[PDB]
């Protein structure tokens, strides 16, 4: 029955070929091992399309489901590593660290994240959440001599290993509140009384579920990791490790707790009204470019939770369409953060000023991905927010969409601040690149993957709202298999 | 207490030094696995031998001398009696000269056997350490017969020759010994030349060039083991 | 008694019993290995004379006294650098001119 | 010895590691308190497997995998401690607050 | 007969929480790590009473013999002879952590006591080394193969985060602007 | 590979096989030792 | 209930062997009268590859006991577990982790 | 007060097995050096293990100057009670069994992993530079030789279909000597015999300071009764390891029919009362007599191989003994 | 465990006849006989330990006929 895990086991094989080539060839393999992982990720993406027609079987003795919801989130995490490898082909190759050793830990977080989306046992949820979390502490401290990545690998460890123990104590209680029954469909058949033991088991698991998606009482790691980590890892944990926490929350809170449902829809509203406020008002007071996108990912998380708390067939379709276009907004913005951090050092705001005459492909990429993150027409993040407020207005929730719209205008002001210091500043107002920009080439190592990860992302950011109707049908078929 | 720091660690070899070559004290400093500096602290056996001889006659100093190189013994008495007998022009008889060659070549065997036992235990295999000293006990009784003591304190070398002649069953007892010990010399050689784990601890480990050996000042089997061919019995 | 260096030697302690208490003395220079095994036998006859209720005098008595001095402390002579000392790398000036 | 006394022991071991997570100032005592949390969820789990559904022990299999992850969370975790110590020459959790605001 | 399984429980149930107070409250960090094995060995003694003789021996092999040795090797590497004794660093923020720890315990003891547990009166552990290996390849098979990729990653990453930079430490490979080796290109600056 | 550890093990596990035999032949010889207080050795 | 058979003598033998040092050190108690270790990361790296491989061996103990009771499908599945972690041993050699 | 007779009679065998090994250490190593060994005490040295242990009880067990008192005293206790406890596993005798645990060759390999902690609180608590260095050196050596030692037990766990040491000797009793696991596992016997010898014997150990890498190792500042656990507890680990060589690979209490001639390592008469007591007692402790052969082989192997350094010790357990232990587990399987 | 039937046949009466054999032939024994001689020590060792201070292997006085 091991034909349903084929998109993950192709990524298991190419995880080992890029590992052995580092051992066999010894840093001469870094010229080809990124491109082998790209077709390893592309071959893992292209085998999800024959799995889309299959009628959603539950393989591996009831511990793994191969539904359309599990295949949608598997492609989002596989595209997150596909966009990350096109970034880090030059980024960690410039720090002097090994390139094949980076993309091995990057692919264990991918297959660890991709197995979260279809897991149904309490143990396989925790095992795949571990190898996503354990791999990500090694990636935020991969540079290993910065006193900023080492400080970010520590804070992510002592919260990540802590919140996965709060997650285990709620997962172990689900084994004990039922008579055994580690599987989540077998959990719901045993417990429906909504006792106090089910409440503490619910709070304990969304201390780790809402830790990967960074809601405000559990968000404290996110702005400190995202400025210390390497920027491709910052690009990965915002769409790959964040959608995997959202891949868990649909598979967990709807399968393990369909009786207790008005409680976690009451907690996640508090998680939404706090992360929409504190994601978007604290991003005003940010000077670093990676720190402005850090509170953005907390703020954009609250928009995804708008469709998660309404609990409708269009509500879960609103959070899957927003997470799909979220990959085309973060990985296009973080590409321009990397592409500006490689030409000049010190990637922060009030150093992008005086651009658009020296790097016009960077400013067209960074503006159209940050303006779409604010949700302005006719970009992809406008239509993604429209469907969140359409599904938000559909079943109650009139104060969430009003807070979702009022914090979207506060969202506009700090995104347009970066577009202010890219295109509206005169050429007598640039601090860095004042005749210091390196006169871009697109001929060095890894810049051509960095350019095609920018061109094909802004095209997927400008046109994914106009051409959203294939994406609206691809998302709405992944919701009928959600209870 | 003991802390873990990042600077190179200095360890003291200590004047205790449970070995058979005296009492050294090496303040050797380490760099993880490689050494970078080492000072030898000597003088723990400085009994003032040079100040003693200025208040000793030659027959009163002949017992004192076989304590510098106490592995050798009569090699110290060789230099001692040769200092006034080559200055006063005192003729040594030819028979007493050949007894000196017989006694000194037996001391060099006992000098090398006392070197060999501790050296084989320091480089690995500890089982020849008990079979080498048995072969030195045969050389002890060859000196215990002719002189009155085992390996040192054997007042045999004199200014006009040697103290006394050999015993009766002595010359036939190297022909029992040095016709039995000579098969075992090649047995000791095949311990390190064969079994190629010992050669990975002795090839290139403590290498000294020929030009640095003459400049630093060396003699015997440390100078000659750099390709010098300088031997004072030939020179 | 520091036997042969007991006459005139500027650095020999004459006998180990000027530092530590001795049970059995053994003359010889050097003693035979048979003669040391007599001193082990003479020692073995002394262990059997030791009594189990006379186990209290085996510990040292502590008649501590204290006085304050005014001697200048000196930095230690033997520091742990021999080759990396700043006098072995090159000969100093005002001496290599006549070399 | 009932089931109730095991879970209170696991809940008390949870809050001792919780207290060691927030009050410890050395960065290694925080990792040692994380192992108190991951053994609290194992002592809770085998007691849940010994008394509930002990014929097919599914908690003891799940108790194995927590031991394996915490073995890999400490090996990864102590390489993070040794990575800071090479740059910042102390191990002091009140000294790593440079990414404050 | 029955009381000898109960008096050995509270002798072990007090041995774990006293050692867990020793790893947390003690001023010496090496005393915490040697008492950390006192936590792990007492829990391993608690598994034998709970019919878990395999996971009991699987804790002494890993938590006592592998993790605690790895902790102790990574504490004798960090001594530095510097504690600096700054107890009241900012405020009395060690009293706010005593509130939540007694609060979670007051939460769970209310939760553990009032919850009706459906304990089964069937005979347990029918040679529980074969029913845990039949579980590694029928039900818990996909967790079992992913544990190898988790361990392989934990050997890749913890080596490259802890190995000595003795290959090329002064290594300026290239530059568009100057970037130090083994450090992120976003250089720190003040606004 | 797997066709080497059956051939890289023989080269010294038989050398200790020819070393365990010679040390057992060291026990074959009579102990040449002077028991002191019952066999004192005659001086010269 | 306690259906484990053989542990009746394990409690007393845990106490008696604990009474071997604590009474012999007491029976002896009535009859008797620049400090640096260099930071070399090889004690931690040799213990690091131990933790990865002590978890390897403890996963193989339930497979080795129930080996002829599982079949050939559970032998290929157990081979994927070992062959992934064989590359973990190859990674430790080539990256000089256990060089000392 | 020692109320189980199976616990008392085993413990008498468990301590006389050590006192054989201290006697056999000082007499076999004297025969390979052509000297006597301990004469003049007992008949021929029979009281020499007793005399070496009883003097350590009567000596003033003083601590060093500035030492951690509780970690110094519990230092040797972490090393030796894990090898005193696992004598509940060893099954000598057909009708003699102390505890029928469901495992025990896995419990022994779990209990032997507490011993690297005792080498860490012996090196640290003695509070000198050369013993902390010898503490990290001795701990990282027993760490290196356990995964080869645990994989050799995995080889005899597939053939026995369990970890029960009563069932392990039961698979070697159907043919007497043709059904022994040493004839079925010729490589994994060597993986067991080298890795167990690198944690209990005197040959692959830096505790004798003949190379002077430290002062005297980790057991430098230990004296008297605390050293008696380090001295008379390393022969407990030698007998315990040799007891399991004579259980796993060689059949414990397994031997052919004794109806033989005078050359059957016995007397001259066929029906002798001295052979009826040498058959009943041998029916009580048989694998102890087999363990006295590998104790003898451990002393005999000390004076053959070189005293190898620590850089080639740790490059043998990981680089050699671990891949040959992995491929033996596959060759024990089908593959 | 017997009281005085087979315990004394192993602890008391058979170590006395090994001590008759160990005193007579220990140094004159050959290479094959000494290997069996070492087996009688390790097998009868709980019996050999009790009657250890009651037998001495010290050699007899000589006659001095010269």
Swiss-Prot record, chain A:
Record's bilayer topology term: Multi-pass membrane protein
Query: Which UniProt keywords are listed?
Result: Membrane, NAD, NADP, Plastoquinone, Quinone, Thylakoid, Translocase, Transmembrane, Transmembrane helix, Transport
Q: Where are the transmembrane segments?
A: 4-24, 32-52, 69-89, 99-118, 122-141, 157-177, 196-216, 230-250, 264-284, 292-312, 320-340, 364-384, 386-406, 452-472
Report the catalytic activity.
a plastoquinone + NADH + (n+1) H(+)(in) = a plastoquinol + NAD(+) + n H(+)(out); a plastoquinone + NADPH + (n+1) H(+)(in) = a plastoquinol + NADP(+) + n H(+)(out)
The cross-references to NCBIfam families, in alphabetical order and at most eight, read:
NDH_I_N, PRK02504.1
Q: How does it assemble?
A: NDH-1 can be composed of about 15 different subunits; different subcomplexes with different compositions have been identified which probably have different functions.
Task: Provide the family line.
Answer: Belongs to the complex I subunit 2 family.
The name this protein goes by in its record = NAD(P)H-quinone oxidoreductase subunit 2
- Species source reads Thermosynechococcus vestitus (strain NIES-2133 / IAM M-273 / BP-1)
From Swiss-Prot, chain B:
**What Enzyme Commission number(s) apply to this enzyme?**
7.1.1.-
What broad class describes the main subcellular location of this protein? Answer: membrane
Full protein segment contained here: 3 to 237 of 394
What subcellular compartments does it reside in?
A: Cellular thylakoid membrane
Which gene is transcribed and translated to give this protein?
A: ndhH
By what name is this protein known?
A: NAD(P)H-quinone oxidoreductase subunit H
The protein's UniProt keywords, in alphabetical order, are: Membrane, NAD, NADP, Plastoquinone, Quinone, Thylakoid, Translocase, Transport
Reaction(s) catalysed (UniProt annotation): a plastoquinone + NADH + (n+1) H(+)(in) = a plastoquinol + NAD(+) + n H(+)(out); a plastoquinone + NADPH + (n+1) H(+)(in) = a plastoquinol + NADP(+) + n H(+)(out)
Q: Which organism is it from?
A: Thermosynechococcus vestitus (strain NIES-2133 / IAM M-273 / BP-1)
The Swiss-Prot or TrEMBL record describes its family as follows: Belongs to the complex I 49 kDa subunit family.
Q: Assembly and interactions?
A: NDH-1 can be composed of about 15 different subunits; different subcomplexes with different compositions have been identified which probably have different functions.
| Annotated function | NDH-1 shuttles electrons from an unknown electron donor, via FMN and iron-sulfur (Fe-S) centers, to quinones in the respiratory and/or the photosynthetic chain. The immediate electron acceptor for the enzyme in this species is believed to be plastoquinone. Couples the redox reaction to proton translocation, and thus conserves the redox energy in a proton gradient. Cyanobacterial NDH-1 also plays a role in inorganic carbon-concentration.
Lineage, uppermost ranks = Bacteria, Bacillati, Cyanobacteriota, Cyanophyceae, Acaryochloridales
From Swiss-Prot, chain C:
Binding of [4Fe-4S] cluster: at which residues?
A: 29
Compartments in which it is found = Cellular thylakoid membrane
Quaternary state and interactors: NDH-1 can be composed of about 15 different subunits; different subcomplexes with different compositions have been identified which probably have different functions.
Please give the function described in this protein's UniProt entry.
NDH-1 shuttles electrons from an unknown electron donor, via FMN and iron-sulfur (Fe-S) centers, to quinones in the respiratory and/or the photosynthetic chain. The immediate electron acceptor for the enzyme in this species is believed to be plastoquinone. Couples the redox reaction to proton translocation, and thus conserves the redox energy in a proton gradient. Cyanobacterial NDH-1 also plays a role in inorganic carbon-concentration.
Would you identify the family this protein belongs to, as annotated? Belongs to the complex I 20 kDa subunit family.
Q: What is this protein called?
A: NAD(P)H-quinone oxidoreductase subunit K
From Swiss-Prot, chain G:
- Which branch of life, at top level? Bacteria
What topology does it adopt in the membrane? Multi-pass membrane protein
Keyword list (alphabetical) reads: Membrane, NAD, NADP, Plastoquinone, Quinone, Thylakoid, Translocase, Transmembrane, Transmembrane helix, Transport
- Tell me where in or outside the cell this protein is found: Cellular thylakoid membrane
For this protein, the Enzyme Commission number is 7.1.1.-
Do you know which InterPro entries this protein is assigned to? NAD(P)H_OxRDtase_bac/plastid (IPR023043), NADH_UbQ/plastoQ_OxRdtase_su3 (IPR000440), NDAH_ubi_oxred_su3_sf (IPR038430)
Q: Which GO terms describe its cellular component?
A: NADH dehydrogenase complex; plasma membrane-derived thylakoid membrane
Gene Ontology process terms (BP): photosynthesis, light reaction
Instruction: From the UniProt record, list the reaction(s) this protein catalyses.
Output: a plastoquinone + NADH + (n+1) H(+)(in) = a plastoquinol + NAD(+) + n H(+)(out); a plastoquinone + NADPH + (n+1) H(+)(in) = a plastoquinol + NADP(+) + n H(+)(out)
Q: Where are the transmembrane segments?
A: 10-30, 45-65, 70-90
User: Does the entry feature the keyword Magnesium, yes or no?
Assistant: no
Q: For this UniProt entry, which residues form the secretion signal?
A: none
- Recall the GO molecular function terms of this protein's record: NADH dehydrogenase (ubiquinone) activity; quinone binding
Task: Write out the function statement from the record.
Answer: NDH-1 shuttles electrons from an unknown electron donor, via FMN and iron-sulfur (Fe-S) centers, to quinones in the respiratory and/or the photosynthetic chain. The immediate electron acceptor for the enzyme in this species is believed to be plastoquinone. Couples the redox reaction to proton translocation, and thus conserves the redox energy in a proton gradient. Cyanobacterial NDH-1 also plays a role in inorganic carbon-concentration.
Record's family? Belongs to the complex I subunit 3 family.
**This protein's name:** NAD(P)H-quinone oxidoreductase subunit 3
Organism per entry: Thermosynechococcus vestitus (strain NIES-2133 / IAM M-273 / BP-1)
């Amino acid at each position: 029955n091991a034909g349903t895990i084929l998109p993950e086991t192709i990524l298991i094989v190419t995880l080992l070929v890029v590992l052995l080539a580092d051992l066999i060839q010894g840093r001469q393999a870094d010229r080809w091992t990124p491109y082998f992982a790209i077709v390893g990720l592309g071959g893992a993406i292209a085998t999800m399309i024959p799995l889309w027609t299959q009628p959603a079987t539950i393989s591996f003795f009831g511990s793994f489901i191969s539904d359309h919801l599990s295949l949608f989130f598997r492609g989002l995490i596989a595209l997150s590593a596909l966009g990350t490898i096109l970034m880090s082909i030059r980024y960690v190759e410039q720090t002097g660290s090994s390139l094949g050793e980076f993309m091995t830990i990057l692919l264990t977080a991918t297959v660890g994240g991709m197995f979260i989306a279809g897991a149904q046992e309490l143990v396989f949820i925790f095992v795949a959440l571990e190898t996503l979390s354990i791999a990500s502490y090694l990636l935020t401290g991969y540079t290993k001599r910065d006193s900023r990545s080492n400080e970010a690998a520590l804070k992510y460890l002592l919260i990540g290993a802590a919140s996965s123990a709060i997650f285990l104590y709620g997962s172990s209680l689900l084994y004990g509140l039922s008579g055994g029954h580690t599987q989540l469909p077998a959990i719901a058949q045993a417990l429906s009384s909504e006792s106090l033991g089910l409440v503490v088991a619910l709070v304990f698991v969304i201390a780790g579920i809402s830790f990967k998606i960074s809601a405000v009482p559990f968000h404290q790691w996110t702005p400190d990791v995202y400025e210390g980590a390497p920027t491709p890892v910052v690009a990965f944990l915002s769409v790959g490790s964040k959608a995997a926490g959202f891949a868990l929350a649909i598979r967990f809170l709807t399968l393990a707790f369909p009786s207790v449902t008005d409680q976690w829809q009451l907690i996640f509203t508090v998680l939404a009204i706090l992360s929409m406020i504190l994601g978007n008002v604290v991003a005003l007071a940010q000077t670093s470019m990676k720190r402005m996108l850090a509170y953005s990912s907390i703020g954009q998380a609250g928009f995804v939770m708008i469709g998660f708390v309404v609990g409708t067939e269009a509500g879960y379709a609103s959070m899957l369409f927003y997470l799909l276009v979220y990959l085309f907004m973060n990985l296009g913005a973080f590409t321009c953060v990397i592409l500006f951090s490689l030409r000049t050092g010190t990637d922060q705001i009030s150093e992008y000023a005086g651009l658009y005459q020296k790097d016009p492909l960077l400013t067209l990429g960074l503006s159209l991905c940050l303006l779409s993150l604010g949700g302005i027409p006719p970009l992809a993040g406008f239509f993604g927010k429209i469907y969140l407020f359409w599904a938000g207005w559909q079943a109650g929730a009139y104060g969430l969409v009003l807070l979702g719209l009022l914090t979207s205008v506060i969202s506009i002001y700090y995104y347009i601040r970066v577009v202010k210091m890219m295109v509206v500043k005169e050429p007598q107002e640039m601090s860095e690149a004042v005749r210091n920009y390196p006169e871009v080439s697109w001929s060095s190592f890894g810049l051509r993957p960095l350019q095609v990860g920018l061109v094909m992302t802004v095209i997927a950011t400008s046109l994914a709202g106009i051409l959203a109707n294939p994406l609206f049908n691809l998302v709405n078929t992944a919701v009928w298999d959600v209870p | 207490k003991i802390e873990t720091r990042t600077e190179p660690m200095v360890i003291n070899m200590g004047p205790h030094h449970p070995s058979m070559h005296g009492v050294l004290r090496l303040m050797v400093t380490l760099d993880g696995e490689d050494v970078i500096d080492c000072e030898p602290v000597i003088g723990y056996l400085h009994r003032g031998m040079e100040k003693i001889a200025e208040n000793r006659t030659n027959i009163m100093f002949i017992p004192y001398v076989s304590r510098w190189d106490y592995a050798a013994g009569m090699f110290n008495e060789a230099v001692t009696v040769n200092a006034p007998e080559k200055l006063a022009g005192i003729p040594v008889p030819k028979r007493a000269s050949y007894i000196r060659v017989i006694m000194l070549e037996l001391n060099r065997i006992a000098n090398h056997l006392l070197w060999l036992g501790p050296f084989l235990a320091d480089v690995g295999a500890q089982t020849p350490f008990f079979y080498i000293f048995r072969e030195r006990e045969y050389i002890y009784d060859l000196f215990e017969a002719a002189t009155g003591m085992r390996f040192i304190n054997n007042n045999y070398f004199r200014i006009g020759g040697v103290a006394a002649d050999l015993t009766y069953g002595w010359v036939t007892k190297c022909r029992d010994f040095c016709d039995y010990f000579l098969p075992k010399v090649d047995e000791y050689e095949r311990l390190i030349t064969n079994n190629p784990i010992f050669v990975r601890r002795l090839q290139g480990v403590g290498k000294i060039s020929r030009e640095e050996a003459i400049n630093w000042g060396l003699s015997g089997p440390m100078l000659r083991a750099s390709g010098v061919k300088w031997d004072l019995r030939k020179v | 008694t520091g036997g042969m260096f007991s006459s005139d030697s500027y650095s020999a302690v004459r006998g180990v019993d000027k530092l530590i208490p001795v049970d059995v003395y053994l003359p010889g220079c050097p003693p035979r290995p048979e003669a040391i095994m007599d001193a082990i036998v003479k020692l073995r006859k002394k262990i059997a004379n030791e009594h189990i209720n006379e186990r209290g005098n085996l510990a040292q008595t502590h008649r501590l006294f204290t006085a304050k001095h005014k001697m200048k402390p000196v930095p230690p002579i033997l520091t742990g650098q021999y080759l990396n000392a700043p006098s072995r790398q090159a000969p100093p000036p005002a001496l290599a001119a006549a070399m | 010895m009932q089931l109730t006394y095991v879970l209170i022991l696991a809940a008390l071991l949870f809050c001792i590691g919780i207290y060691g997570l927030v009050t410890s100032r050395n960065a290694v005592r925080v990792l040692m308190s994380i192992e108190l949390l991951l053994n609290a969820v194992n002592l809770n789990l085998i007691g849940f497997a010994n008394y509930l559904d002990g014929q097919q022990i599914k908690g003891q299999v799940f108790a194995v995998f927590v031991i394996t992850v915490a073995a890999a969370e400490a090996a990864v975790g102590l390489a993070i401690i040794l990575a800071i110590y090479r740059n910042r020459d102390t191990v002091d959790m009140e000294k790593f607050n440079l990414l404050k605001w | 007969a029955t009381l000898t399984q109960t008096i050995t429980f509270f002798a072990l149930a007090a041995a774990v929480i006293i050692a867990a107070l020793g790893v947390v409250l003690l001023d010496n960090v090496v005393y915490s790590a040697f008492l950390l094995g006192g936590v792990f060995l007492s829990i391993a003694g608690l598994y034998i009473l709970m019919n878990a003789d395999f996971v009991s021996a699987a804790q002494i092999l890993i938590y006592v013999g592998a993790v605690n040795v790895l902790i102790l090797f990574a504490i004798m590497l960090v001594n530095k002879r510097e504690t600096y004794t700054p107890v009241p660093g900012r405020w009395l923020r060690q009293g706010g952590a005593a509130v939540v720890s007694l609060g979670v315990f007051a939460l769970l003891t209310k939760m553990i006591l009032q919850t009706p547990w459906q304990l089964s009166s069937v005979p347990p552990t029918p040679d529980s080394i074969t029913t845990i290996g039949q579980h590694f390849f029928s039900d818990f098979l996909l967790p079992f193969e992913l544990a190898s990729v988790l361990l392989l990653m934990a050997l890749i990453g913890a080596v490259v985060l802890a190995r000595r930079e003795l290959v090329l430490e002064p290594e300026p490979i290239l530059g568009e602007e100057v970037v130090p080796p083994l450090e992120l290109p976003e250089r720190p600056r003040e606004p | 590979q797997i066709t080497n550890y059956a051939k890289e093990a023989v080269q010294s596990a038989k050398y200790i096989g020819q070393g365990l035999s010679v040390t057992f032949d060291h026990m074959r010889r009579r102990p040449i030792t002077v028991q002191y207080p019952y066999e004192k050795l005659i001086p010269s | 209930v306690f259906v484990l058979s053989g542990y009746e003598y394990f409690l007393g033998f845990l106490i008696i062997c604990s009474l071997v040092p604590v009474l012999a050190l007491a029976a002896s108690a009535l009859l008797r009268p620049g400090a640096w270790i260099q930071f070399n990361v090889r004690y931690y790296m040799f213990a690091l590859v131990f933790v990865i491989f002590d978890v390897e061996t403890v996963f193989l103990y339930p497979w080795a006991v129930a080996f002829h009771q599982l079949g050939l499908l559970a032998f290929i599945e157990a081979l994927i577990f070992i062959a992934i972690l064989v590359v973990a041993l190859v990674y430790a050699w080539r990256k000089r982790a256990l060089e000392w | 007060l020692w109320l189980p007779l199976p616990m008392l009679m085993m413990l008498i065998v468990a301590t006389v097995g050590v006192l054989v090994a201290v006697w056999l250490e000082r007499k076999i190593s004297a025969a390979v050096q052509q000297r006597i060994g301990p004469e003049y005490i007992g008949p021929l040295g029979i009281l020499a293990p007793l005399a070496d242990g009883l003097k350590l009880i009567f000596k003033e067990d003083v601590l060093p100057a500035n030492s951690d008192r509780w970690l110094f005293t519990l230092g040797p206790a972490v090393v030796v009670i894990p090898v005193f406890l696992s004598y509940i596993i060893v099954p000598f005798g057909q009708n003699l069994l102390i505890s029928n645990l469901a495992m025990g060759v896995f419990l022994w390999i779990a209990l032997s992993s507490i011993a690297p902690i005792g080498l860490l609180m012996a090196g640290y608590a003695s509070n000198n530079k050369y013993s902390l260095l010898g503490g990290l050196r001795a701990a990282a050596q027993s760490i290196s030789y356990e995964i080869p030692l645990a994989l050799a037990v995995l080889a005899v766990a597939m053939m026995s279909n369990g970890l029960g040491t009563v069932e392990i000797v039961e698979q070697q009793s159907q043919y007497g000597i043709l059904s022994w696991n040493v004839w079925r596992q010729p490589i994994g016997f060597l993986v067991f015999w080298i890795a167990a010898l690198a944690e209990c014997e005197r040959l692959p150990f830096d505790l004798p300071e003949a190379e002077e890498e430290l002062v005297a190792g980790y057991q430098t500042e230990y004296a008297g009764m605390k050293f008696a656990l380090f001295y008379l507890g390393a022969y407990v680990n030698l007998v315990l390891s040799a007891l399991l060589v004579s259980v796993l690979y060689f059949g414990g209490w397994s031997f052919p029919i004794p109806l033989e001639t005078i050359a059957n390592l016995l007397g001259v008469s066929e029906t002798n009362p001295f052979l009826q007591i040498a058959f009943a007692v041998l029916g009580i402790t048989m694998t102890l007599i087999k363990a006295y052969f590998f104790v003898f082989l451990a002393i005999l192997l000390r004076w053959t191989v070189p005293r190898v350094r620590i850089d080639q010790l740790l490059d043998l357990g990981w680089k050699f003994l671990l891949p040959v232990g992995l491929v033996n587990l596959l060759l024990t399987a089908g593959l | 465990g017997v009281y005085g039937a087979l315990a004394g046949l192993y602890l008391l009466v058979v170590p006395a006849i090994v001590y008759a054999y160990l005193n007579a032939r220990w140094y004159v024994a050959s290479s094959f006989e000494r290997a069996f001689m070492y087996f009688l020590v390790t097998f009868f060792f709980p019996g050999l330990l009790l009657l250890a201070p009651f037998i001495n292997f010290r050699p007899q006085p000589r006659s001095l006929n010269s």
